Symmetry: D2
Subunit: 60 residues, 4 copies
């Protein structure tokens, strides 16, 4: 029984490790997503500003 | 209208669709993060609940013997 | 019933809830991947559409001059 | 005009790079998620097997 209770406790320690590691991983992914969203938004605005300026020149 | 006017209007419609998809996906990601945090916390809580009951029983049986 | 019987039944209910949350989150992740692939492909397609129209106009104006 | 058209093209090349890098990043995240789901499922089954066995002994 002692051996199986230790085995049960060792598995629970492995589970606790996995859960907190994945929780931290999800925390890091959200920060990277936000950074990608900002960079693409900035690039899309740079391209759109050049496009709108050039379109205005051709029309006028 | 001319071919250039039509294509420039198509370009404006494409840029409007891109802007909409970007904000929609950005909002979608924010909803997932709130759901992810909720699921990870509840599952961790359940795992600790089960582990606490086990530790209680193991300790109680130890007093018994 | 005794305190041990009640706690063992609570343990079984906790394990059933854990199994349900795990499969629910696993299924949820699969739905997100299909949506992610769909959004990334459409946005990339829109960006190439706008870039193709730009390249066409740039080439057409080049013939004009 | 030539300078602005180059600037517009350079931004579009930066956008294309960002989109494909993020698409690959999402592809890698799904593979890691699947691996975490398998490991936790295995650990949860190991712990549940030990628990069910011990509960059966105490009852019987």
């Amino acid at each position: 029984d002692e051996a199986l209770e230790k085995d049960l406790n060792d598995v629970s320690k492995e589970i606790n490790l996995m859960l907190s590691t994945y929780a931290k991983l999800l925390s890091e992914r959200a920060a990277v997503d936000a950074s990608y969203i900002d960079e693409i938004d900035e690039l899309f605005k740079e391209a759109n500003a050049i496009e709108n300026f050039l379109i205005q020149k051709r029309e006028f």
